[PDB]
Coordinates of C-alpha atoms in Angstrom, one line a residue:
Chain K
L247 CA 39.0 111.5 2.5
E248 CA 35.2 110.7 1.9
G249 CA 36.5 107.0 0.5
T250 CA 38.9 106.1 3.1
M251 CA 37.3 107.2 6.5
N252 CA 34.0 106.4 5.7
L253 CA 31.5 104.5 3.0
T254 CA 27.8 105.4 4.0
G255 CA 26.0 108.6 4.1
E256 CA 25.4 109.2 0.4
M257 CA 22.2 111.5 0.8
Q258 CA 24.0 114.4 -0.5
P259 CA 26.9 115.3 2.1
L260 CA 29.5 114.7 -0.1
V261 CA 27.8 116.2 -3.2
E262 CA 27.0 119.5 -1.1
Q263 CA 31.0 119.7 0.0
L264 CA 31.7 119.2 -3.6
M265 CA 29.3 121.9 -4.8
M266 CA 30.4 124.3 -2.0
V267 CA 34.3 123.8 -2.9
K268 CA 33.2 124.2 -6.5
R269 CA 31.6 127.5 -6.2
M270 CA 34.6 129.2 -4.0
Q271 CA 37.5 128.0 -6.8
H272 CA 38.0 127.3 -10.5
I273 CA 35.0 125.7 -11.3
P274 CA 35.0 123.9 -14.8
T275 CA 33.0 121.2 -15.2
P276 CA 35.7 119.4 -17.1
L277 CA 38.5 120.0 -14.5
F278 CA 35.9 118.9 -11.8
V279 CA 35.2 115.8 -13.7
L280 CA 39.1 115.0 -14.0
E281 CA 39.7 115.8 -10.5
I282 CA 36.9 113.5 -9.1
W283 CA 38.3 110.8 -11.4
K284 CA 41.7 111.3 -10.7
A285 CA 41.0 111.0 -6.8
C286 CA 38.8 107.8 -7.8
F287 CA 41.7 106.1 -9.6
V288 CA 44.7 107.2 -7.6
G289 CA 43.0 104.9 -4.8
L290 CA 43.0 101.4 -5.1
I291 CA 46.5 101.6 -6.7
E292 CA 48.9 102.9 -4.0
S293 CA 46.4 102.8 -0.7
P294 CA 45.0 99.3 -0.4
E295 CA 47.1 95.9 0.1
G296 CA 45.2 93.0 0.6
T297 CA 41.5 93.2 1.4
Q298 CA 41.0 97.1 1.2
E299 CA 41.0 96.9 -2.7
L300 CA 37.6 95.3 -2.3
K301 CA 36.6 98.4 -0.8
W302 CA 38.5 100.6 -2.9
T303 CA 36.6 99.1 -6.1
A304 CA 33.3 99.6 -4.6
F305 CA 34.1 102.9 -3.8
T306 CA 34.9 103.6 -7.6
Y307 CA 31.5 102.1 -8.6
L308 CA 29.8 104.4 -5.8
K309 CA 31.2 107.2 -7.3
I310 CA 29.2 107.2 -10.2
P311 CA 25.5 107.3 -8.4
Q312 CA 27.3 110.1 -6.7
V313 CA 28.1 112.0 -10.0
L314 CA 24.9 110.8 -11.7
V315 CA 23.0 112.6 -8.8
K316 CA 25.0 115.9 -9.0
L317 CA 24.2 115.9 -12.6
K318 CA 20.7 115.7 -12.1
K319 CA 20.4 118.4 -9.4
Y320 CA 23.5 120.5 -9.8
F321 CA 23.7 121.4 -13.2
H322 CA 20.4 121.8 -15.5
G323 CA 20.3 123.0 -18.9
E324 CA 24.1 124.1 -19.5
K325 CA 26.0 121.4 -21.0
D326 CA 24.1 118.5 -19.7
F327 CA 27.0 116.2 -18.8
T328 CA 26.8 115.1 -22.7
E329 CA 29.6 117.6 -23.5
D330 CA 32.0 118.2 -20.4
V331 CA 31.9 114.3 -19.3
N332 CA 33.1 113.5 -22.7
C333 CA 36.0 116.7 -22.7
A334 CA 37.0 115.1 -19.2
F335 CA 37.4 111.6 -20.4
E336 CA 39.4 112.8 -23.4
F337 CA 41.0 114.9 -20.7
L338 CA 41.7 112.0 -18.5
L339 CA 42.4 109.4 -21.5
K340 CA 45.5 111.7 -22.5
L341 CA 47.1 110.5 -19.3
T342 CA 47.7 107.0 -20.2
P343 CA 50.6 105.7 -18.1
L344 CA 48.3 106.6 -15.1
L345 CA 45.8 104.0 -16.5
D346 CA 48.4 101.8 -17.3
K347 CA 49.7 101.2 -13.9
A348 CA 45.9 101.2 -12.9
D349 CA 45.8 98.0 -14.9
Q350 CA 49.1 96.9 -14.0
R351 CA 48.1 96.8 -10.2
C352 CA 44.8 94.7 -11.0
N353 CA 46.7 92.7 -13.6
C354 CA 43.4 92.5 -15.3
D355 CA 41.9 95.9 -14.9
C356 CA 42.3 96.7 -18.7
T357 CA 39.0 94.9 -19.6
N358 CA 37.5 95.9 -16.5
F359 CA 38.2 99.8 -17.3
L360 CA 36.6 98.8 -20.4
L361 CA 33.4 97.7 -18.6
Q362 CA 33.3 100.4 -16.3
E363 CA 33.7 103.0 -19.0
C364 CA 30.4 101.8 -20.5
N365 CA 28.9 101.2 -17.1
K366 CA 29.3 104.9 -16.7
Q367 CA 27.2 105.2 -19.8
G368 CA 24.2 105.4 -17.5
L369 CA 25.0 109.0 -17.5
Chain X
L978 CA 87.9 91.5 -43.0
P979 CA 88.5 88.2 -44.2
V980 CA 91.8 87.5 -42.6
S981 CA 89.5 87.6 -39.8
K982 CA 89.3 84.1 -39.4
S983 CA 93.1 83.8 -38.7
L984 CA 92.7 85.1 -35.2
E985 CA 89.4 83.2 -34.8
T986 CA 90.9 80.2 -33.6
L987 CA 94.2 82.1 -32.7
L988 CA 92.1 83.7 -29.7
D989 CA 91.2 79.9 -28.5
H990 CA 95.1 79.1 -28.3
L991 CA 96.4 82.3 -26.5
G992 CA 93.1 83.1 -24.9
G993 CA 94.6 82.3 -21.4
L994 CA 97.3 85.2 -21.7
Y995 CA 94.3 87.8 -21.1
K996 CA 94.1 86.6 -17.6
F997 CA 96.2 90.0 -16.6
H998 CA 94.3 93.0 -18.2
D999 CA 90.9 93.6 -19.8
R1000 CA 90.0 96.7 -21.4
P1001 CA 87.3 95.7 -24.3
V1002 CA 85.1 98.6 -23.8
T1003 CA 87.0 101.1 -25.8
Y1004 CA 88.2 98.4 -28.4
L1005 CA 84.3 97.8 -28.9
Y1006 CA 83.5 101.5 -28.8
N1007 CA 85.9 102.6 -31.5
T1008 CA 84.4 100.0 -33.7
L1009 CA 80.6 100.7 -33.4
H1010 CA 81.1 104.5 -33.9
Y1011 CA 80.9 105.2 -37.3
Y1012 CA 81.3 101.7 -38.8
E1013 CA 77.7 100.5 -37.7
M1014 CA 76.1 101.9 -41.1
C1015 CA 78.4 99.2 -42.7
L1016 CA 79.1 96.9 -39.8
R1017 CA 76.9 94.3 -41.2
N1018 CA 79.8 92.7 -43.0
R1019 CA 81.7 92.3 -39.4
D1020 CA 78.3 91.5 -37.6
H1021 CA 77.4 88.6 -39.8
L1022 CA 80.9 87.2 -38.7
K1023 CA 80.7 88.5 -35.4
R1024 CA 77.8 85.7 -35.3
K1025 CA 81.0 83.8 -34.5
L1026 CA 83.2 86.3 -33.0
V1027 CA 80.9 86.7 -30.0
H1028 CA 82.5 83.4 -28.5
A1029 CA 86.1 85.1 -29.5
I1030 CA 85.8 88.5 -27.9
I1031 CA 84.0 86.6 -25.1
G1032 CA 87.5 85.1 -24.7
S1033 CA 88.8 88.1 -22.6
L1034 CA 85.8 87.9 -20.2
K1035 CA 85.9 84.1 -20.0
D1036 CA 89.6 84.2 -19.0
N1037 CA 88.8 85.2 -15.4
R1038 CA 87.6 83.7 -12.1
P1039 CA 86.1 86.5 -9.8
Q1040 CA 82.6 84.7 -9.3
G1041 CA 81.1 88.4 -8.7
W1042 CA 79.4 88.6 -12.3
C1043 CA 75.7 87.7 -11.8
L1044 CA 73.7 88.7 -15.1
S1045 CA 76.9 88.0 -17.2
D1046 CA 76.0 84.1 -16.2
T1047 CA 72.2 84.8 -17.8
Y1048 CA 73.8 86.2 -20.9
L1049 CA 76.4 83.6 -21.2
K1050 CA 73.2 80.9 -20.8
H1051 CA 71.6 82.9 -23.6
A1052 CA 74.6 83.5 -25.9
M1053 CA 76.0 79.9 -25.5
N1054 CA 73.5 78.3 -27.7
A1055 CA 71.3 79.7 -30.5
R1056 CA 73.1 83.1 -30.9
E1057 CA 70.3 84.9 -32.5
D1058 CA 67.1 83.2 -30.6
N1059 CA 67.7 83.2 -26.8
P1060 CA 68.1 86.6 -25.6
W1061 CA 65.2 87.8 -27.8
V1062 CA 61.9 86.8 -26.0
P1063 CA 62.6 88.6 -22.5
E1064 CA 64.1 91.6 -23.8
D1065 CA 62.4 94.2 -22.0
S1066 CA 62.7 92.5 -18.6
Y1067 CA 66.6 91.6 -19.5
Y1068 CA 67.2 95.2 -19.9
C1069 CA 65.3 96.5 -17.0
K1070 CA 67.5 93.9 -14.9
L1071 CA 70.7 94.8 -16.7
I1072 CA 70.2 98.5 -15.9
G1073 CA 68.9 97.7 -12.2
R1074 CA 72.0 96.2 -11.6
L1075 CA 73.7 99.5 -12.2
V1076 CA 70.8 101.6 -10.4
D1077 CA 71.4 99.4 -7.4
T1078 CA 74.8 100.1 -7.1
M1079 CA 74.2 103.2 -4.8
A1080 CA 72.2 101.9 -2.1
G1081 CA 72.1 98.2 -2.3
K1082 CA 74.5 95.6 -1.6
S1083 CA 77.2 97.6 -3.7
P1084 CA 80.5 96.5 -1.8
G1085 CA 79.5 92.9 -2.1
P1086 CA 79.8 90.1 -4.5
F1087 CA 80.8 92.6 -7.5
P1088 CA 83.7 94.3 -5.8
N1089 CA 86.6 92.0 -4.8
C1090 CA 90.4 91.4 -5.6
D1091 CA 91.2 93.6 -4.2
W1092 CA 89.4 96.7 -4.1
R1093 CA 92.0 98.4 -5.8
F1094 CA 91.8 97.1 -9.1
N1095 CA 88.1 96.0 -8.8
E1096 CA 86.9 98.1 -11.7
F1097 CA 85.2 100.3 -8.8
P1098 CA 86.0 103.8 -9.4
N1099 CA 83.3 103.9 -11.6
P1100 CA 81.3 100.7 -12.0
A1101 CA 79.1 101.5 -15.1
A1102 CA 81.6 100.3 -17.7
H1103 CA 80.6 96.7 -16.4
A1104 CA 77.1 96.8 -18.2
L1105 CA 78.4 98.4 -21.5
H1106 CA 80.4 95.5 -23.1
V1107 CA 77.7 93.3 -22.3
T1108 CA 75.1 95.6 -24.2
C1109 CA 77.4 95.7 -27.3
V1110 CA 78.4 92.0 -27.7
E1111 CA 75.1 90.6 -26.6
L1112 CA 73.7 91.5 -30.1
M1113 CA 77.0 92.6 -32.0
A1114 CA 76.5 89.1 -33.6
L1115 CA 73.3 90.3 -35.0
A1116 CA 72.4 93.1 -37.4
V1117 CA 70.2 94.6 -34.8
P1118 CA 72.4 97.1 -32.9
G1119 CA 72.6 100.9 -33.9
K1120 CA 69.0 101.6 -33.9
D1121 CA 66.8 99.0 -31.8
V1122 CA 69.1 98.6 -28.8
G1123 CA 69.0 102.2 -27.7
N1124 CA 65.4 102.6 -28.5
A1125 CA 64.8 99.6 -26.4
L1126 CA 66.8 100.7 -23.7
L1127 CA 65.0 104.2 -23.7
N1128 CA 61.5 102.1 -23.7
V1129 CA 62.1 101.0 -20.3
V1130 CA 60.6 103.8 -18.9
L1131 CA 57.5 105.2 -21.3
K1132 CA 56.8 101.7 -21.6
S1133 CA 56.6 101.3 -18.0
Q1134 CA 57.0 97.3 -16.9
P1135 CA 56.2 95.5 -13.6
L1136 CA 59.9 95.5 -12.8
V1137 CA 60.3 98.9 -13.2
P1138 CA 59.7 101.0 -9.9
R1139 CA 58.0 104.2 -9.7
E1140 CA 59.8 105.6 -6.3
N1141 CA 63.5 106.2 -7.8
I1142 CA 62.3 107.1 -11.4
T1143 CA 65.1 110.1 -11.3
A1144 CA 67.5 107.5 -10.3
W1145 CA 66.7 105.2 -13.1
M1146 CA 66.8 108.2 -15.4
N1147 CA 70.4 108.9 -14.4
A1148 CA 71.2 105.2 -14.8
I1149 CA 69.9 105.7 -18.5
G1150 CA 71.8 108.9 -18.9
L1151 CA 75.1 107.2 -17.7
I1152 CA 74.6 103.9 -19.8
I1153 CA 73.7 105.7 -22.8
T1154 CA 76.4 108.6 -22.8
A1155 CA 79.1 106.0 -23.2
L1156 CA 77.6 104.1 -26.1
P1157 CA 79.1 105.0 -29.4
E1158 CA 77.3 107.5 -31.7
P1159 CA 74.4 105.3 -33.6
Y1160 CA 73.2 103.9 -30.1
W1161 CA 72.7 107.3 -28.3
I1162 CA 71.6 108.9 -31.8
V1163 CA 67.8 107.4 -30.8
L1164 CA 67.0 110.4 -28.9
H1165 CA 66.7 113.0 -31.7
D1166 CA 64.4 110.6 -33.5
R1167 CA 62.6 109.9 -30.4
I1168 CA 61.8 113.1 -29.6
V1169 CA 60.9 114.4 -33.0
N1170 CA 58.9 111.7 -34.5
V1171 CA 56.6 111.0 -31.5
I1172 CA 56.8 113.6 -28.8
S1173 CA 56.5 116.9 -30.9
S1174 CA 54.2 115.3 -33.1
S1175 CA 52.0 112.5 -31.5
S1176 CA 49.0 114.4 -32.0
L1177 CA 49.9 117.3 -29.3
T1178 CA 48.8 119.8 -31.6
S1179 CA 45.4 119.5 -33.1
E1180 CA 44.0 117.4 -30.4
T1181 CA 46.0 119.5 -27.9
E1182 CA 43.5 119.1 -25.1
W1183 CA 42.0 120.7 -22.2
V1184 CA 45.4 119.8 -21.2
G1185 CA 46.6 122.8 -22.7
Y1186 CA 48.1 124.4 -19.8
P1187 CA 52.3 123.8 -20.5
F1188 CA 54.0 124.7 -17.9
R1189 CA 52.6 122.2 -15.3
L1190 CA 52.8 119.4 -18.1
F1191 CA 56.2 119.8 -19.3
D1192 CA 58.3 119.8 -16.2
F1193 CA 58.8 116.6 -14.5
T1194 CA 58.7 115.9 -10.8
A1195 CA 54.9 116.5 -11.8
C1196 CA 54.8 112.9 -11.2
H1197 CA 54.9 113.0 -7.6
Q1198 CA 51.2 112.1 -7.7
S1199 CA 50.3 108.9 -9.6
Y1200 CA 48.5 111.8 -11.8
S1201 CA 50.1 114.0 -14.6
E1202 CA 52.1 111.3 -15.6
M1203 CA 51.7 111.9 -19.2
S1204 CA 54.2 110.0 -21.7
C1205 CA 55.6 113.3 -23.3
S1206 CA 57.2 114.4 -19.8
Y1207 CA 58.6 111.1 -19.5
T1208 CA 60.8 111.8 -22.7
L1209 CA 61.7 115.5 -21.6
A1210 CA 62.8 114.3 -18.4
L1211 CA 65.0 111.6 -20.0
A1212 CA 66.4 113.8 -22.4
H1213 CA 67.3 116.2 -19.6
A1214 CA 69.2 113.5 -17.7
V1215 CA 71.3 112.3 -21.0
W1216 CA 71.9 115.7 -22.3
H1217 CA 73.0 116.4 -18.6
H1218 CA 75.5 113.2 -17.8
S1219 CA 76.6 113.3 -21.7
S1220 CA 77.3 117.0 -21.1
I1221 CA 81.0 116.6 -22.7
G1222 CA 80.8 116.3 -26.5
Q1223 CA 77.7 114.8 -27.7
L1224 CA 76.1 118.2 -27.4
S1225 CA 77.7 119.8 -30.6
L1226 CA 74.9 117.6 -32.4
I1227 CA 72.0 120.1 -30.9
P1228 CA 72.7 122.8 -33.4
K1229 CA 72.5 120.9 -36.4
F1230 CA 69.7 119.1 -34.9
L1231 CA 67.3 122.1 -34.2
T1232 CA 68.2 124.0 -37.7
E1233 CA 67.6 121.1 -39.6
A1234 CA 65.1 118.7 -38.3
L1235 CA 63.2 120.7 -35.7
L1236 CA 62.0 124.0 -38.3
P1237 CA 59.6 122.0 -40.2
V1238 CA 57.9 120.2 -37.8
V1239 CA 56.6 123.4 -35.4
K1240 CA 53.8 125.1 -36.0
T1241 CA 52.0 125.8 -32.6
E1242 CA 53.5 127.6 -29.4
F1243 CA 53.7 125.0 -26.9
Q1244 CA 55.7 123.1 -29.2
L1245 CA 58.1 126.0 -29.1
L1246 CA 57.6 125.6 -25.3
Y1247 CA 58.8 122.3 -25.6
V1248 CA 62.0 122.8 -27.3
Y1249 CA 62.2 125.7 -24.7
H1250 CA 62.4 123.0 -22.0
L1251 CA 64.7 120.8 -23.9
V1252 CA 67.2 123.1 -24.8
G1253 CA 67.1 125.9 -22.2
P1254 CA 69.4 124.7 -18.8
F1255 CA 72.2 123.4 -21.2
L1256 CA 72.7 127.0 -22.4
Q1257 CA 75.1 127.5 -19.8
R1258 CA 76.9 124.2 -20.2
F1259 CA 77.3 125.3 -23.6
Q1260 CA 78.4 129.0 -22.9
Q1261 CA 81.1 127.1 -20.3
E1262 CA 83.4 126.6 -23.6
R1263 CA 81.2 125.8 -26.7
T1264 CA 80.5 129.5 -27.3
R1265 CA 79.8 129.0 -30.9
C1266 CA 76.7 127.1 -30.9
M1267 CA 75.0 129.6 -28.8
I1268 CA 74.1 132.2 -31.4
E1269 CA 72.9 129.3 -33.8
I1270 CA 70.9 127.9 -31.0
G1271 CA 69.6 131.4 -30.3
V1272 CA 68.6 132.2 -33.9
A1273 CA 66.9 128.9 -34.3
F1274 CA 64.7 129.9 -31.4
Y1275 CA 64.0 133.2 -33.2
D1276 CA 63.3 131.2 -36.2
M1277 CA 60.7 128.8 -34.4
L1278 CA 59.3 132.3 -32.9
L1279 CA 58.9 133.5 -36.2
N1280 CA 57.7 130.3 -37.6
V1281 CA 54.7 130.0 -34.8
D1282 CA 53.6 133.9 -35.0
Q1283 CA 53.1 133.5 -38.9
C1284 CA 50.8 130.7 -38.1
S1285 CA 48.5 131.4 -34.8
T1286 CA 45.4 132.9 -34.0
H1287 CA 46.4 134.2 -30.5
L1288 CA 49.5 134.3 -28.4
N1289 CA 48.6 133.7 -24.9
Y1290 CA 51.3 132.2 -23.4
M1291 CA 54.1 134.2 -24.5
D1292 CA 54.4 136.4 -21.7
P1293 CA 57.0 134.6 -19.8
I1294 CA 58.7 133.5 -23.2
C1295 CA 59.4 137.4 -23.8
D1296 CA 61.2 137.5 -20.5
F1297 CA 62.7 134.3 -20.9
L1298 CA 64.4 135.2 -24.4
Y1299 CA 65.2 138.6 -22.5
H1300 CA 67.5 136.8 -19.7
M1301 CA 68.9 134.4 -22.2
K1302 CA 70.2 137.4 -24.1
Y1303 CA 71.1 139.5 -21.1
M1304 CA 73.2 136.7 -19.1
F1305 CA 74.2 134.3 -22.1
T1306 CA 74.9 136.1 -25.5
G1307 CA 75.0 140.0 -24.9
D1308 CA 75.3 142.0 -28.5
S1309 CA 76.4 138.8 -30.4
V1310 CA 73.2 137.8 -32.0
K1311 CA 72.1 141.4 -32.6
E1312 CA 73.2 141.7 -36.3
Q1313 CA 71.3 138.3 -36.9
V1314 CA 68.0 139.1 -35.1
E1315 CA 67.6 143.0 -36.0
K1316 CA 66.1 141.8 -39.4
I1317 CA 64.2 138.6 -38.0
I1318 CA 62.5 140.6 -35.3
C1319 CA 60.8 142.7 -37.2
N1320 CA 58.6 140.1 -39.1
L1321 CA 56.8 139.5 -35.8
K1322 CA 53.3 140.5 -34.7
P1323 CA 53.0 143.8 -33.0
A1324 CA 52.2 142.6 -29.5
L1325 CA 55.4 140.6 -29.4
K1326 CA 57.2 143.7 -30.9
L1327 CA 56.0 145.9 -28.5
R1328 CA 57.3 143.6 -25.9
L1329 CA 60.8 142.9 -27.4
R1330 CA 61.3 146.7 -28.2
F1331 CA 64.0 146.8 -25.7
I1332 CA 65.9 144.0 -27.5
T1333 CA 67.1 146.9 -30.1
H1334 CA 69.7 148.0 -27.2
Chain B
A615 CA 37.9 86.4 24.4
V616 CA 37.4 90.1 23.9
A617 CA 35.5 90.5 27.2
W618 CA 38.6 89.4 29.0
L619 CA 40.8 91.3 26.9
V620 CA 38.9 94.0 27.9
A621 CA 39.0 92.6 31.8
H622 CA 43.1 92.1 31.3
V623 CA 43.5 95.7 30.2
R624 CA 41.8 96.7 33.3
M625 CA 43.4 94.6 35.6
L626 CA 47.2 94.3 36.4
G627 CA 47.9 90.8 35.2
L628 CA 51.4 91.0 36.0
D629 CA 51.7 87.2 36.3
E630 CA 50.2 87.4 32.8
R631 CA 48.5 83.9 33.6
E632 CA 45.0 85.3 31.5
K633 CA 47.3 85.4 28.6
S634 CA 48.2 81.3 28.7
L635 CA 44.4 80.6 28.5
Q636 CA 43.7 83.5 26.0
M637 CA 46.3 81.6 23.6
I638 CA 45.0 78.2 24.1
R639 CA 41.3 79.6 23.4
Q640 CA 42.6 81.4 20.2
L641 CA 44.6 78.2 19.2
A642 CA 43.6 76.5 16.1
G643 CA 44.8 73.6 17.7
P644 CA 41.5 71.2 17.8
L645 CA 41.2 70.3 13.7
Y646 CA 37.6 68.9 14.9
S647 CA 38.6 66.0 16.6
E648 CA 34.8 65.5 17.7
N649 CA 32.6 65.0 14.6
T650 CA 30.7 68.2 15.2
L651 CA 28.9 68.7 11.8
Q652 CA 29.5 72.3 10.7
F653 CA 30.6 72.4 6.8
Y654 CA 33.0 75.1 7.6
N655 CA 35.6 73.7 9.9
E656 CA 38.3 75.7 8.0
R657 CA 36.4 78.6 6.7
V658 CA 34.6 79.4 10.2
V659 CA 37.8 78.9 12.1
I660 CA 39.8 81.4 10.0
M661 CA 36.5 83.6 10.2
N662 CA 36.9 83.7 13.9
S663 CA 40.7 83.7 14.3
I664 CA 40.8 86.9 11.9
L665 CA 37.8 88.4 13.8
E666 CA 39.4 87.9 17.2
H667 CA 42.9 89.2 15.6
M668 CA 41.1 92.4 15.2
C669 CA 40.6 92.9 18.5
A670 CA 43.1 92.6 21.4
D671 CA 45.6 94.1 19.3
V672 CA 46.3 97.2 21.6
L673 CA 46.2 94.8 24.7
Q674 CA 48.8 92.4 23.1
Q675 CA 51.3 95.7 22.7
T676 CA 50.8 96.2 26.1
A677 CA 52.4 92.7 27.0
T678 CA 54.4 90.0 25.4
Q679 CA 54.2 89.3 21.7
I680 CA 51.0 88.1 20.0
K681 CA 50.7 84.4 19.8
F682 CA 49.6 85.0 16.2
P683 CA 46.1 83.4 16.3
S684 CA 44.7 84.6 12.8
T685 CA 47.4 83.0 10.3
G686 CA 46.2 84.9 7.3
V687 CA 47.7 86.2 4.2
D688 CA 48.0 89.7 5.3
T689 CA 47.3 91.3 9.0
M690 CA 45.5 94.6 9.3
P691 CA 46.6 97.5 7.2
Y692 CA 45.5 100.3 9.2
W693 CA 47.1 101.0 12.7
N694 CA 49.1 103.8 14.7
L695 CA 52.5 103.4 12.8
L696 CA 53.7 106.1 15.3
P697 CA 57.3 105.8 16.6
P698 CA 57.7 104.7 20.1
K699 CA 59.8 107.7 21.6
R700 CA 59.3 110.5 19.1
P701 CA 57.4 114.0 20.0
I702 CA 54.2 114.5 18.5
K703 CA 55.4 117.5 16.7
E704 CA 55.9 115.2 13.5
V705 CA 53.4 116.4 11.1
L706 CA 55.5 119.8 10.3
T707 CA 58.9 117.5 10.3
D708 CA 57.5 114.8 7.9
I709 CA 53.9 114.8 7.2
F710 CA 53.0 118.4 6.3
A711 CA 56.4 119.0 4.6
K712 CA 56.1 116.1 2.5
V713 CA 52.4 116.8 1.4
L714 CA 53.0 120.4 0.7
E715 CA 55.1 118.7 -2.3
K716 CA 53.3 115.5 -2.5
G717 CA 49.9 117.0 -3.3
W718 CA 47.4 114.2 -3.3
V719 CA 46.9 114.0 0.5
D720 CA 48.9 110.7 0.8
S721 CA 45.7 108.5 1.5
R722 CA 48.1 106.4 4.1
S723 CA 48.8 109.8 5.8
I724 CA 45.2 110.6 6.4
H725 CA 45.0 107.6 9.1
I726 CA 48.2 109.6 10.6
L727 CA 46.3 112.9 10.6
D728 CA 43.3 111.5 12.1
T729 CA 45.0 109.6 14.9
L730 CA 47.1 112.7 16.1
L731 CA 43.9 115.0 15.8
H732 CA 42.2 112.9 18.5
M733 CA 45.6 111.8 20.4
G734 CA 46.4 115.4 21.0
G735 CA 43.7 118.2 20.7
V736 CA 41.9 120.4 17.9
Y737 CA 43.7 123.6 19.4

């Protein structure tokens, strides 16, 4: 919803909502990060047809400043996004056919994903 | 064989006589069943006999067969070179030809003359002889054909869709079940060598939760499309459409291959999700192999209990085994399991205490 | 063009004499006959056409078929997509009964949800 309906408003409204739903539910950092990444990758694949993918990719690369701000603010001194992010990536990299279809949609997203992964090395 | 050269030219003489009837499917199935382990002597000459057996298919004129034209284009020159480059796409189109026989233009160019002899009480036999003869001229069939056919799902291709994936699994199960023994023998190795042992055990994952992962239709979303679930769904479809006589190979398969390849518990859960629903199909008439599958499950349970730290996902397993004994076997496996259940852990013992009745 | 689409959606226009002028205005007929130096005779024209096509969509539905002024690769992906003569209680029939199984919110269906919300009533 935050991706399709809107694109602006990034002070921390989506951050606040994600935190709030994180409190009152099962809140593992691995599961939370896999969930945000799965919602980030299920878009850009089935939703866009033409010029919408150019916005889906901008959303996928705006998602990581959001998770960076979240790591800076939400978590502090308890698995400081060094171990849990890796566990979630392993929790994500296990599902290969999803990433295969994602690369097949853009037809060049394999190397693009390789760059987006080292792009997420800011956190 | 060597007298086989006698009718190699005879089919060129009386090849027109076959313009009346045509059943080469059984003639080839009865040939590649157990001879395939030594069929290379016949296949080096099938390098030529591909143009002889094709005499029956060439001695017609319906003008409804479409992919047969591509097969001819690739098999009428360089009999070992042409159909080999686009193998994946070729198999995808070949099985799409059958999977579209339920929604697309099914009563169109294919069935005619006169819809009562059009080979349409069942159209699957159209894509059987092709799969056979296209590579019977080579030494490839038996292990690579069936595996490459199965490789159209887990190795997703841009020509394979994602909506009717269950219909495509049905098509695979219907195509594979009719091929002879070596073709559908792939499933056992495809399960054991890769699925149960890809890593799946030490690198298990935070994925650990089995029940959501194994069962298909979890690929309703683009997520949870793990390559191990694909094989489980495909094995389900195959065992379902082939649930006539090829199920007699599962007891020896389990009690010979699956024992020293299982150490953890979700491997046992995968074996359960494999051989669970077909227990009623077995109990229908094959009442013998029931006790063998039961004692195989018990032995796998002992093997995982002897090597494990904590058994957490065993609570549904207890009632699974309960109902499996209650509504399928009764008291027939009792003498065999009395000396087997005792070597378990105290928790599992306290749970399955009621089995002693 | 936008102002008089607004004017036509307010007036009757039963003779549809305004559409005959709007089509000629939006028409890409003049291939820069006059030597008007712009450096974007094709790009600016395509931009103007796809911009005009973004508006005047609901209007051309209340009248004869659109004159196809855009002439682009793909049209706008997001629209009503609501059946002509069908009751609004279709969320339970098709949308919600599917999302209960299809548990990723069906990014194409979220627009249907928003349209139904602001077309009916929150209560």
